[PDB]
Design an enzyme around this catalytic site. Structure first.
Site, PDB file in Angstrom:
ATOM      1  N   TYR A   1       0.844  -1.189   0.000  1.00  0.00           N
ATOM      2  CA  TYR A   1       0.000   0.000   0.000  1.00  0.00           C
ATOM      3  C   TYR A   1       0.892   1.256   0.000  1.00  0.00           C
ATOM      4  CZ  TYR A   1      -3.692   3.279   1.434  1.00  0.00           C
ATOM      5  OH  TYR A   1      -4.518   4.371   1.565  1.00  0.00           O
TER       6      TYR A   1
ATOM      7  N   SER B   1      -6.307   1.408  -4.223  1.00  0.00           N
ATOM      8  CA  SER B   1      -6.421   2.821  -3.858  1.00  0.00           C
ATOM      9  C   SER B   1      -5.045   3.498  -4.019  1.00  0.00           C
ATOM     10  CB  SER B   1      -7.029   2.948  -2.449  1.00  0.00           C
ATOM     11  OG  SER B   1      -7.459   4.268  -2.165  1.00  0.00           O
TER      12      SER B   1
ATOM     13  N   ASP C   1     -17.702   4.352  -7.402  1.00  0.00           N
ATOM     14  CA  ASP C   1     -16.537   4.680  -6.571  1.00  0.00           C
ATOM     15  C   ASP C   1     -16.338   6.185  -6.562  1.00  0.00           C
ATOM     16  OD1 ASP C   1     -14.126   5.056  -5.197  1.00  0.00           O
ATOM     17  OD2 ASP C   1     -12.970   3.642  -6.306  1.00  0.00           O
TER      18      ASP C   1
ATOM     19  N   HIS D   1     -15.798   2.018  -3.843  1.00  0.00           N
ATOM     20  CA  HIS D   1     -14.378   1.899  -3.521  1.00  0.00           C
ATOM     21  C   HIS D   1     -14.018   0.570  -2.874  1.00  0.00           C
ATOM     22  CE1 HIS D   1     -10.415   3.603  -3.470  1.00  0.00           C
ATOM     23  NE2 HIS D   1     -10.282   3.459  -2.164  1.00  0.00           N
TER      24      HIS D   1
END
Length: 710
Positions: free
Chosen positions: A473, A554, A641, A680
């Site tokens: 991430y 993301s 999203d 999302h």
């Protein structure tokens, strides 16, 4: 392999913008309009080629069935107590949404309290946020449709589960807190805006306000309690103090772990809550985070990072508030991050620490900060906790890569605080006996040692022959800690894979300095760290470039898209979920303005110079070397999203397909799938989750040509 052709996609060659003397063409700018026929026809044409590609091969069915079987196991959340009742969430396994149950005691019959499944045919209405009144007799809950951040707050009387008429609209990024008089509840809402507010729009969200709703009235009667008309990006989250005497207001601007802290003494309100409150601006800047733990009279305990990047606990006395007067209740550790703190049974503090990306749980005395008790835990994460000030007990939940989860319970009224297994569900899942989790620390480009978890079968040969799934991430102070994933274990067991999670900079694993090490000018550190993780797996013989898949969602979708641009030779396969791809325009849409604290903003010449170098949309470039092509790539997004607007993935795929997909040497597929009635990720129905990960691993299987291992 590739028996389809990419759609012709119109290029607007007039779409040119000057960024501080640098000209940038944006020929797919028209994909920024989600409502146009052009955009919808673009999405249809893409899904038309991607869907047969993912579904052609029998391994998708094999994965989907195995996943379904393995998900078909009852799952409990943590109990929590509210007023005189116990509550918990439960799923028989395959229910689209987990269900809230209520019981009158721990050993009593449970009944359905709130079942979101009955609110839609396909499970796309989901619970998002809830708050019980202080006496536990009333219940406010947010509902989201189709995965949108937009919420409608509804209300129930707890006894008899009675629906009330009260309905609150235009709610987004809202805290929900009831006054202890039970009269009404604070919440946040946005002003009326032009066009749609259903999650398909790109409209920026500004001028969030704080309101108070008196139960039994129309929303139009709601009292405005705080607004920041000169600071449109500010967001004020309210919370009542444990004794009900103070409203605390945490004002944020951006996603940094900092906040202003104002308070209102509610006893000092002449005639109750009737207008803008008498805010006392205790901390009136964004230099530090102040997270309310509890108070005793005017002595307020906060978790803070103020001069303490690994976090600590301080006491601020409202009647003597100067910084030099603050008492340090629990000092900062040199290495271990204080993740969170709760106050329970009046004078106990529960502290959750992160020690080398694993959790430890401790009980401390509120008066002194003294350690009282260590709650024993295996290696992994604490992922549920309940226990507030007036509770005399806690529940907490443990999870790890190889452990499906255990819920513990501890009675805090007992002289000796022995915790006990409260709940463990025993299904015949994947046998983890033959697998292990190791933690290594690999050097990055600049010599920094980066943690990485590796999950694999015991005694595998390190000959580079195994498929590997590398996850990252790398941002927003998020720590990626061990977590049970059925989907990844199927990859391990039935696809012979190795799982890896790299704790790259930008995350919160080593506190605020870890976070600062991966943002703004230093964002490239994240990408270097992650590419260096790939090089470690290859060099140590876990896998090879052509057998290696990378995944992120993301900010993590940004991560993997960038690494595909920068090191296409290093990866066989790339799956970017809901990723931020346009680093020059991200701030213009919905809540994207909040991320400039991590990324910077292209309006600044300095920031533009950082962003342009890694912005995935602006760095798609056919590799020079004759023997290098782009890896197989799959972008996953969805039409509601509104966290990361789908135009990011839309423009990026058009760009991949034109710049790289047109080349004769490019034989690896570059594909997008856009789901419907999804957003999302949060609140996505079980059915869509299974569809999605079956797609992902089917994509991996066929691009690596992997046999299913029964």
């Amino acid at each position: 392999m590739l028996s389809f052709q990419y759609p012709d996609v119109y290029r607007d060659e007039t779409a040119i913008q000057d960024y501080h003397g640098h000209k940038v063409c944006d020929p797919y700018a028209w994909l920024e309009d989600p409502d146009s026929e052009q955009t919808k026809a673009f999405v249809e044409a893409q899904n038309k080629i991607t869907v047969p590609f993912l579904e052609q091969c029998p391994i998708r069915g094999l994965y989907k069935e195995r996943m379904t079987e393995l998900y078909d196991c009852p799952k409990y959340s943590c109990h929590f107590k509210k007023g005189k009742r116990y509550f918990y969430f439960y799923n028989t396994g395959l229910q689209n949404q987990r269900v809230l149950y209520v019981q009158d005691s721990l050993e009593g019959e449970a009944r359905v309290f709130l079942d979101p499944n009955i609110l839609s045919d396909d499970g796309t209405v989901a619970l998002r946020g809830y708050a019980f009144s202080e006496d536990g007799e009333y219940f406010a809950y947010g509902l989201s449709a189709s995965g949108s951040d937009w919420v409608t707050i509804k209300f129930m009387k707890v006894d008899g589960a009675k629906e009330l008429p009260d309905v609150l609209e235009r709610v987004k990024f809202s805290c929900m807190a009831w006054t202890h008089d039970g009269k009404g509840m604070f919440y946040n809402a946005y002003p009326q805006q032009d066009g749609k507010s259903d999650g398909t729009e790109t409209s920026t969200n500004l001028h969030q306000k704080l309101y108070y709703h008196v139960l039994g009235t129309d929303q139009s009667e709601d009292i405005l309690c705080a607004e920041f008309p000169d600071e449109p990006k500010w967001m004020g989250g309210a919370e009542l103090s444990d004794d009900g005497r103070y409203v605390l207001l945490s004002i944020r601007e951006g996603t940094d772990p900092v906040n202003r802290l104002w308070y209102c003494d509610l006893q000092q309100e002449s005639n109750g809550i009737t207008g803008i409150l008498k805010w006392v601006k205790l901390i009136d800047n964004f230099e530090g985070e102040y997270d309310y733990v509890t108070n005793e009279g005017t002595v307020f305990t906060f978790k803070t990072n103020r001069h303490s990047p690994n976090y600590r606990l301080i006491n601020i006395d409202f009647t003597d508030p100067e910084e030099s007067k603050w008492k340090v209740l629990v000092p900062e550790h040199e290495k271990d991050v204080l993740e969170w703190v709760a106050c329970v049974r009046s004078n106990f503090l529960v502290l959750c620490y992160l020690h080398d990306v694993k959790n430890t749980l401790q009980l401390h005395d509120l008066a002194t900060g003294a350690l009282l008790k260590i709650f024993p835990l295996e290696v992994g994460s604490v992922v549920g906790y309940s226990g507030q000030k007036k509770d005399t007990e806690i529940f907490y939940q443990f999870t790890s890569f190889l452990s499906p989860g255990i819920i513990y319970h501890c009675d805090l009224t007992k002289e000796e605080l022995e915790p006990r297994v409260f709940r463990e569900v025993t299904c015949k899942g994947i046998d983890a006996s033959d697998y292990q989790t190791v933690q290594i620390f690999y050097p990055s480009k600049d010599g920094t040692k980066i943690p990485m978890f590796i999950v694999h079968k015991k005694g595998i040969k390190l000959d580079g022959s195994h498929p590997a799934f590398l996850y990252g991430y790398g941002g927003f102070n998020i720590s990626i800690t061990p977590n049970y994933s059925v989907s990844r274990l199927i990859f391990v067991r039935h696809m012979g894979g190795v799982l890896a999670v790299a704790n790259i900079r930008g995350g919160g694993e080593y506190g605020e300095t870890w976070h600062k090490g991966g943002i703004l000018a230093n964002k490239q550190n994240c990408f270097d760290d992650f590419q260096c993780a790939a090089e470690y797996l290859i060099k140590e013989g876990y896998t090879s470039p052509k057998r290696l898949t990378i995944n992120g969602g993301s900010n993590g979708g940004l991560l993997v898209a960038t690494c595909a641009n920068q090191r296409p030779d290093l990866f066989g396969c790339v799956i970017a979920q809901v990723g931020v791809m346009d680093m020059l325009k991200f701030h213009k849409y919905t809540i994207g303005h909040a991320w400039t604290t991590d990324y910077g903003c292209s309006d600044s010449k300095q920031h533009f110079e950082w962003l342009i170098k890694y912005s995935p949309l602006h760095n798609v470039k056919l590799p020079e070397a004759d023997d290098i092509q782009y890896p197989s790539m799959l972008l996953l997004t969805a039409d509601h999203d509104d966290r990361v607007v789908p135009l990011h993935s839309l423009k990026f795929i058009a760009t991949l397909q034109y710049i790289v997909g047109r080349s004769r040497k490019q034989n690896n597929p570059l594909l997008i799938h856009v789901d419907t009635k999804a957003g999302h990720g949060a609140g996505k129905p079980t059915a869509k989750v299974i569809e999605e990960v079956s797609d992902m691993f089917a994509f991996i299987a066929r691009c690596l040509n992997i046999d299913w291992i029964p």
